[PDB]
Every structure is written in structure tokens, then in C-alpha cells.
Amino acid sequence: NSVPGAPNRVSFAKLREPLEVPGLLDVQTDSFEWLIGSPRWRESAAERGDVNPVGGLEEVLYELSPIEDFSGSMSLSFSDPRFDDVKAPVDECKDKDMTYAAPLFVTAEFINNNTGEIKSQTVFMGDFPMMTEKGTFIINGTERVVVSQLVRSPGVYFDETIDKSTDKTLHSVKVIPSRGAWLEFDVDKRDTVGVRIDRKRRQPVTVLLKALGWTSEQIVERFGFSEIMRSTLEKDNTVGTDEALLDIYRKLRPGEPPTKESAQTLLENLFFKEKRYDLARVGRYKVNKKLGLHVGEPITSSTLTEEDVVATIEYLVRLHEGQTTMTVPGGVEVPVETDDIDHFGNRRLRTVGELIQNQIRVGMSRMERVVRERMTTQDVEAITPQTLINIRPVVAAIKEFFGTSQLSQFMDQNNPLSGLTHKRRLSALGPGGLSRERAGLEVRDVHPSHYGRMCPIETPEGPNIGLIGSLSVYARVNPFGFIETPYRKVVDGVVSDEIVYLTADEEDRHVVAQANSPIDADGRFVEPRVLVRRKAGEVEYVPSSEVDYMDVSPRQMVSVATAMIPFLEHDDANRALMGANMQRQAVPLVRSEAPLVGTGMELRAAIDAGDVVVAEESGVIEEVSADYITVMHDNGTRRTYRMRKFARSNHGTCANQCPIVDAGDRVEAGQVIADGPCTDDGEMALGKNLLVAIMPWEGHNYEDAIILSNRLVEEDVLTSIHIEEHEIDARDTKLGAEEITRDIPNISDEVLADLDERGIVRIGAEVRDGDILVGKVTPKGETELTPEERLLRAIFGEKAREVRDTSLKVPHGESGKVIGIRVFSREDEDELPAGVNELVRVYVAQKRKISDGDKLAGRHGNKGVIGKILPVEDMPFLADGTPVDIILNTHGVPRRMNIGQILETHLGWCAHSGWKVDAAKGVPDWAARLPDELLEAQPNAIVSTPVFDGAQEAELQGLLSCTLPNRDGDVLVDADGKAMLFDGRSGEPFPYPVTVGYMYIMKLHHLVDDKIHARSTGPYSMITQQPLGGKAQFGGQRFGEMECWAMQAYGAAYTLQELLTIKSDDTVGRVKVYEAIVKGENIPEPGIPESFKVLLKELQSLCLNVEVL
């Protein structure tokens, strides 16, 4: 639907979709799209209001310029930031390990005050990383992604608390700007106020107010209504402006002689000097909105004007009096209520744009205080604009952000959906925000405002639940950073089509309708009443007159990864969350078959994932080949697409790609041309459809274990590809320079039958565990060999050498062909790190079959390892002779409340056999509603079932009584949906009909080849003699504490001591036991370790004489 060449996936839905899904990747591209300032965003935020737009960079320069020294004799100004064209295209930048950027130019001008000059000079600011078409960045060849961050928005926050002593209500306020000072207006258990600005112990409201230039009469005039401040003024003890101004200054410093500076300069240099205290363009808006200030205004400023303060002051006193509304001279009346910190109306989302703008600003705040410092001590009249601009700090800051920053993460891409959902993520943790251990379980809970903005289902299971969430489908980011959602406004019970994006603030004030309401052909609520969501957040019920807004469609709450689970409204939240988190972990198979029964988010989430080569302009195919395709547009110029074949992903998967068109086909703009890793015909296909039964089979699938058939191994139905990358480097050492050469110290000649004449192996060599990949050799140095060895070299006429055999050998348990070999050299201009003459990398491919130990999983969160793989001949086979493929257990279905995975098992069979409603005289009651043209479907037909609007419990049962016979008229699955299986092992049939169907399962990326480990004796750390391993090093297992407790509970002293002494640290013990073992003698009885003759020395180093008696 609304896609040129998409497949025809029948749908079970009943409602319409007035609004179609947005540009899922918009939150990254159209969000970036504001630092550069491309005309695209110009028109976007110029047609929908936005009187005057200013780019992300321009908004920095226009706050930096004009550079002015303290002498006031000269000035520097910046303007017109523009970008050139990129140097190297994406692909090349991904291959040569060079960062994908473009040049940045800013017009700079210096002017003198004595006489003045008009020197304008285009200053090159440096390289700037650009955002690829998919929304990711390329840094040093690695594809990284920036993740938006949730942060409470600067502004005014009120609140109230109860004291246990007297049990009254104390109403506090706070004003939190970006890079400023905080001043809570507390209201103590007693009176009167909590003026304690900048956290200095307190102050009285009349002090700061009067010090602002207020007569003691005006205070009682405005704020007397409102008598609680009468006591504040009475007990203030101070009369006059400076009489309390110098007291404020005292409490601030303290301990310094008061003056006229310490009285007025301070106050005017903490709130009204827009260089040390400035609340960003957002705060200046959240404050006006909260209070009833200039709100109707193009207003643009960052100084906390006196007025605002006074307002909030009385606001506070009005709160702890008992009232609802508040007004101010000339201001729009606002309601009085304590704000909530977690409400999605006070929690903005700094996207990838503001994070880069912040880094650019922090850099400018280093490159800025380098001109005005080299502006006085330079030769005046001899300086040119470029002579002052030391750009280096800015590029350094940028590179220090895109690297080593905990918000720039390697794009988790082992399949299209994992990549798509790595973007659109919002993590409340990270820099500038809260932490993971210092944030109580309040920011984790789901708030009734998250409906439509953040999905409540999708979230990690580890110690991050609630801290890392994902955007919804229809949501959209405001120009400030607040998340919006589209509603349809209904006027007088007549549902219209005027879509209106509401934020989180202006949603509670109104009344929101429900998605699935009985509208009758016009927009009239058939029934007299309707469900609603009132301000507070409760679920009320109202008449069909107050309803003004209504959701555009169900599944608004659901994210993208979640909107692909069929029958979601039948699964529990735990299992639904596990299913949503176990899809971004699947692996791309070799065939990539589409799912038989999914939802509408398949076709519309692959073309947006950025791994499906989409025809750009409607043309006609001219030539196709596994390597590339060419389209001949209707207007002359053609265009050649280059599909990437067998490219390694970041997690080791395969990035294959293959055309899906012929040499004559006509194509239109948007249509799919080449499939992706996990796509099929241009739509997500993460796994395969397998015939599954639901019986427990003789104890091989016990407690989540799964058994398979050999067919899935013979017919390459779950075979996957994996490409690993090994790397070695040859540097210069103290004795010389390491050389990568075919020559080697004492070694055989059968371990060189695959290395080319110059070391590195030849492409196509079937390597295995232990073999050699790169021939390296390092200078030995100089030593002196004992007799036994000199009398041995003489015998074998092999004079010794001065090199060590330190090559690059394949790690343990790894095989497969050698695909690619990359080589960089300092002698060949191939830039590399310091002290590195050469650097080689070797890619090894491997086709992994399914094997017991590999984890599998369906969409509904059900998972399990593969325990047994029976031959194809002993497996419960239907009456025809078709063996079931997988055999799931029953005891896992009921107690986990995921009966969803059963419904799709039933439907999965229907859509596999194909039905035809027998309504040739009249549509049966059960199926007189759902669609038309869905009363019959050819065998092996595709279908769809939207998340909360799909098939119905009473419809499957109607689609299960029409299951046309396979070849000879013989219905195999009776009405209830159960077959009569024959026991392939014993021969006779099972005594009860068993449930069978077609389930869509996926092979996760937790294969045993990754987990299996072992270590007999490896390398040990030098400082601490405990075992240690790395890439090609075993590593050693960790015998923790509770294990020692268990050992002691057994009373096994010798085993514990052995695990503690001759296996971890005792160097004289490990070798003395290894020698015994290898010689076949008795293991020496564990004595007292040598780690006890070191405690005595460490004590005696303190003048403590400890003696063993």
C-alpha cells in the first residue's frame, strides 16, 4: 500500500489510517539538518510558522561575535558559515579508514577602534563530519551513531512537601537555568521564606526584592494579599537598599568589606549579565508559559529580567495559601499548581544537533579566549583576521566528542531492524544527565504521559530498565526538544481529518478520545458516550460532546520494534518486552525468507532502514549483475547503483545484497531494487517458517529446550555467514624494526605451504585452528645459551639466530576460507599510528550450520537452546509423511501468559493451506465483517494482523474450518486445530490429537562457538600472577566468593586451597605441579603458599614484628 512494487499482504484490520507513518529516520536527519542549515530545514521551519530561522552554527557565532577585549580598542566578528562539498564519498571513506567530513568556512572580520579597518578574510575552520543518507556518521572508517538524551528542561519548578514534626505543607520553588545560579524560594516549617539564592543558607524575600530597587511600601502593596510576607517584612530587620544589599553580599562571599561594587555589580553580574547566567532559548519559553509573561511575542532573550522573579515570588506565596489561578499585570492568567519532574512536558530531548552545538560552543570557549589574550600582546596594525584565529582547539574538541564520548556508540548492526532501533533511542543516562546508581526508581516507572511518545514495552532487561527507551512510531520532535504526537480534532462529535501535533503540555488540558471508537461514515460517535484520557491521567468515561481530540490509530504507544509482533494484545508485558528485545539480536540467514503472518510494519521499516537499494528516479532497467545495476531514466542520464557484497558488519554478520529485477522491468521512484541482509522482496524477514508441534517429546525439550529436524541442516534453512577480522602490526623496537616476512626461526616446511612469497596468506586458503596467517619476526636481542643448548646447535648444524617467532596465528576454534587481505605501510604513505611501519588485516569467512547449543526464538519472547536434532526419519510426521520441523514444549505456554505464540501457530497453518469461506449463499455470521475479498486465499498466502487491530478469537475458529486439502482431499487439521501424528520412532500413532502449525522463528546471535571457552595453562599477568587472557588467550575462569562459601560448606579443604593457591598465584606451585603431572608423579601436598611470606614483609615495613609460634 502506497509503495510502487511492494508485495500484496492481505490485512485483517478494520479501521483506516488517516495519517501514514512518518520518515522513521527523521529524528536524526531532519534533526541534524539544523546545525549545517541546509535550505531544506530553512523551508521546513519557515513554512510552519518560525518567522525567522537561524541555523545551529549561526546561533553560536551570533552569541560569540563580536569579540571585544577589555581595552575596547578592537573587535573581531564572525558570520556566514558555509560548507564545501565532501572530499571522499562514503564507500571510499569506509575503506581507507578516513573520516567522512567536509570543509567549514566562516567569514571573519577585524575592526579597529582607533581608526578602524574592514579586513574580511574567509577563515578555514577545519573538517566537519557530515551525516550519511541513512543517518549515521563515519569516523575512522567505523560507522557510529549519536543517541539523543533526555534531560529536564531549564525553567521554573514548584513543589510541595509535608513535614513529620508538625505535618503542615511547605511549598518550595526553584529556577534552574543552563549555566547559571539557583535560587529556591523555600517556605520553612515556620515562616517566612526560603530566598536562599545560589545555596547560601537563606535570605528573606524582602531583602532581594528591596535590593532590586523596591520601596518597602510597594512590597506590601503588591504582595499583601498574600499576608504571609508581612511577617517576612516585619522580621527582616533591614531598612533600605544597601542596608540589606551589603548583607546579601556578606552571605554571598562571605567575609569581605562591602562596597558599591559588592552591592550592585554582583546582582547585575549573576542574573542580568547575559554572559555568565543565560537560560537557553527554551527556558525563556517555559518560563513565559508557566508564568503568563510576554508569551505572545517574538521575544528572544536570556536575561532573567527582574519582573519574572517578582512574579514567581508572589506565585509561591499564592501556592501556599490555597488557590487555583494566578494573574499578573498585563499577563495572561495561568493556573497555579505544583509541577511534576517526570511529566513529559518538563523533560526535553537533546538530539544529535544540540549535542554537536554544545561541543562546538565548548570549543569556541577555548578558541575565543586565545585571541583576546593574543590581541593585546600582539603587534597592533600588523594583525590580520587569520593571524588571531587558532582553529585547532575546535577540531580537537570535535574529534574528542565523536570519540571517547559515551553518547557516540558503534552502530549495532547485525540486521536492518537492530540498526533502525539503535537510532530513535533515548537514554536518560550519560553526560550532563543523571547516573545509573544515583537515580531512584522514579525515573524508571512509566508515566501516563509516555502514551504516544515513548514506548513502554521496548526496553533493556539489565540494570537499565526505564533509563533507555525508544521513540514511538507517529511521534515527532518539537523545535525545542519536546516530543509531539498527532491527534485528530473532533468538533461537535464529528470526527474531522484536521491532524494537529500536540505536545505533552497542551494535551492534559484537553480531552483525548480513544483510537477504536464506533465512528459512522462521517465522524459521529455512534454510541452516546466514549472513553477518554482526562488531564490527571486517569481513564474516565464521558459523553460524546466533550471529546475534542482522538488518536489517529491504535499502536501509537508502540515503538517500531514492537509494532511487528502479531497478536501483541494477547501477550504479557514481560514476554512482549523480551520478544521486542530479541528481534534486534537475530542474524541474517542465506535465503532470508519473508514471514507468513506479520503486521504492516514489515514493508515500511525495511525501505527506511537504509539497507534496501531504492530506485531513485522512475526509469527502466538496462543492465543487472550481481555486482551492480544500471537504470536508464526517462530523461537521458542513467544511474548505476553499486550493491555491496559480502561486507563485514560491526558484529561479524554478512552484509550481502542482491538485485531483484530483470533486464527489462520498469521501475518507479521508491520501488525496491536490491534486497538486504534480512530482507526479502523489500520487506523485513528475520527468520524462517517452520512446521511446529506443541507436544513434549521424550524429554529432549525439557524446560525451554528445543528439538529440530535434520531437514533444517541438510537444506541450509538456518545456515548463516560470519566474517571475522584479524589484525597485526609491525613497528620499530629498541633493537630494530619488526619485519613481516616469510622467513621464520626454527620451523617446519609444512606450515608454509599456504603463505605467499611475501608472508601473508593467499586468498582462498582453507585455514583452521592454530595455522599461520601473517609471518612476523622480531629481534631477539642478545643472550647466552647454557652448554646443553650449544652442544645441540652444533650437532644439528643450525647456528642460532637473533629473532623471535612472534607471528599472527589463528585463535582457538576458528576456521573457514580467507576472503580479503588489507595492508597499509608507512613507507607507502599509508598513514598509521606512531611507531608503526606496517599493518595487515585478514578477513576469514565461515558458514555456520544450526547446531545443538544455538539459541532460537520466536516473536513472542519464547526462547531456548537447541538440545537435540533427530534424523529426518524419526520425527512426528503428519498422516501424509511430512515430518514436523521443530517440537516446542507445552509446559512453557500456560504459566508465561504468551498464548499469542499459539494463535499465530493456528493462523500460520491457514495462511499456509489457504481457505475459502463456504459462504456461497450467505456470509456466515462470524466472518460477515472483517474484510471483503478475504473469504478465500490461495495456498501459501501472505497475511497481516496489526498490533491492536487484527484477527479475532472468533475469526480464526472460522478460518480453521476451511483448510483446503493438500493434494488429495483430506483435511489434516480438524476444527480445533489438531492433527493426528504418527510416532516416527515407535511406529504407532499417538493416542491424542496434537496441535501443529507454522511458526516463524529466528536464529539469535548467541552461538556456542562464541561462548565455549577453556584453559589448561595460558599467560599470567605480570603485576598480579593471576591468569590473564585476551584475543587469542584462554583467559581463565573466575572462582568467586560464594563458590568458596559452598566449598567450605562441603568441608572440602584441599580442593578449596588448590583452587586458591596452585591455580591463581603461587608461581613456585604451578610449575611444580605441572612438572609432577607431566612426569606422572604425585601432586605435591599443598603447603603454606608463598603469598604468606610477603604479608610478613609488608608488615615489618611498618615496624611490626610478627612471629609465628
Binding site: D188, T192, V193, G194, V195, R196, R201, R202, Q203, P204, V207, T232, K235, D236, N237
Partner: peptide
Amino acid sequence: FVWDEDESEALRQARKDAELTASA
């Protein structure tokens, strides 16, 4: 009487610790 609280009890300890550190 807007003297909040704990200002004296905190300042006497701060000054005492500062005097100790200067004595060191």
C-alpha cells in the same frame, strides 16, 4: 528573624576545621 538555621552550627565547624588545616 529570617535567620534560617544551622548557619552558626555549621560555620563554627567549618572555621574550626579550617583552623586545624592551617595548623597542619
